[PDB]
Design an enzyme around this catalytic site. Sequence first.
Site, PDB file in Angstrom:
ATOM      1  N   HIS A 182       1.410  -1.057   0.533  1.00 13.45           N
ATOM      2  CA  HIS A 182       0.205   0.025  -0.527  1.00 13.45           C
ATOM      3  C   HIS A 182       0.940   1.653  -0.024  1.00 13.45           C
ATOM      4  CE1 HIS A 182      -3.512  -2.579   1.210  1.00 13.45           C
ATOM      5  NE2 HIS A 182      -1.602  -3.235   1.662  1.00 13.45           N
ATOM      6  N   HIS A 241       2.787  -6.123   3.107  1.00 12.87           N
ATOM      7  CA  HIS A 241       2.141  -6.644   3.859  1.00 12.87           C
ATOM      8  C   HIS A 241       2.325  -8.744   2.913  1.00 12.87           C
ATOM      9  CE1 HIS A 241      -0.752  -4.021   4.884  1.00 12.87           C
ATOM     10  NE2 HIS A 241       0.159  -3.642   5.584  1.00 12.87           N
ATOM     11  N   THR A 275      -7.372  -5.633   5.292  1.00  9.95           N
ATOM     12  CA  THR A 275      -8.167  -3.758   5.528  1.00  9.95           C
ATOM     13  C   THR A 275      -8.042  -3.575   4.573  1.00  9.95           C
ATOM     14  OG1 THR A 275      -5.464  -3.676   4.610  1.00  9.95           O
ATOM     15  CG2 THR A 275      -5.460  -4.114   6.756  1.00  9.95           C
ATOM     16  N   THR A 276      -8.320  -5.305   3.353  1.00 11.31           N
ATOM     17  CA  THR A 276      -9.368  -4.514   2.227  1.00 11.31           C
ATOM     18  C   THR A 276     -10.487  -5.165   2.379  1.00 11.31           C
ATOM     19  OG1 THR A 276      -8.605  -5.872   1.399  1.00 11.31           O
ATOM     20  CG2 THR A 276      -7.626  -3.910   1.221  1.00 11.31           C
TER      21      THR A 276
END
Length: 257
Positions: A93, A116, A195-196
């Site tokens: 990200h 990640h 986180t998505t």
Amino acid sequence: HWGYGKHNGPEHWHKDFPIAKGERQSPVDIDTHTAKYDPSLKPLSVSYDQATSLRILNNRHTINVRFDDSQDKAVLKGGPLDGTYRLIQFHFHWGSHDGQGSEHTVDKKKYAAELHLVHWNTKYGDFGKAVQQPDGLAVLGIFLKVGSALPGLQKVVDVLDSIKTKGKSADFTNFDPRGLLPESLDYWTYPGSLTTPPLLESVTWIVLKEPISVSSEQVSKFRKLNFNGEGEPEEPMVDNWRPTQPLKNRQIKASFK
Ligand SMILES: [Zn+2]
């Protein structure tokens, strides 16, 4: 479809994925003054010497390097984890400028990017079964901080032009992810989520304290990726991070005194 725009970004996600407002959401702010050293954490074991990278993909949300997860060739163990977690993929990200990009923050500070490395619990048999379980996934999070270029990253930046638009992929063999680790494995850990979307609460987060260094020039190549497919209106792939969410009734543990 969800994304990071004004009309489809993090504020919208809850309408299709209501767990967006759940009790164990990620990412979070790590407050270094109040995260407590936990002596029951065992030593962390990142074992990636036999990792077998296969392919790299622009999926319209990020770029991801997928690995052969058919056997225990690259695994994460120890720290807060019970059992063995196999590496499946790593992605990033990043921001439209160097002052933001990371998902986790440390004392409210944002880094230029976050890596990640996504692993799944081998007792569930594959990624798809694992991601449905509270203890199914472990993600190792590593901040990128602007400074000297990292050679370990250069093989990734070099192929970005071949996967500029969504859907594009390329062969990506013989990439060794150990080149993306900092010196120290000191970390913070907390139970959270993807986180998505679908934002499933299946992740043990392990966020390393020490950032890896990347050059301004390396991060800028990421910013010339596109969210859009070939020939649609251009939409640079930047600011593909979700803001921090409330810690609620959770503890961030420190691995180090
Ligand atoms: Zn999608």
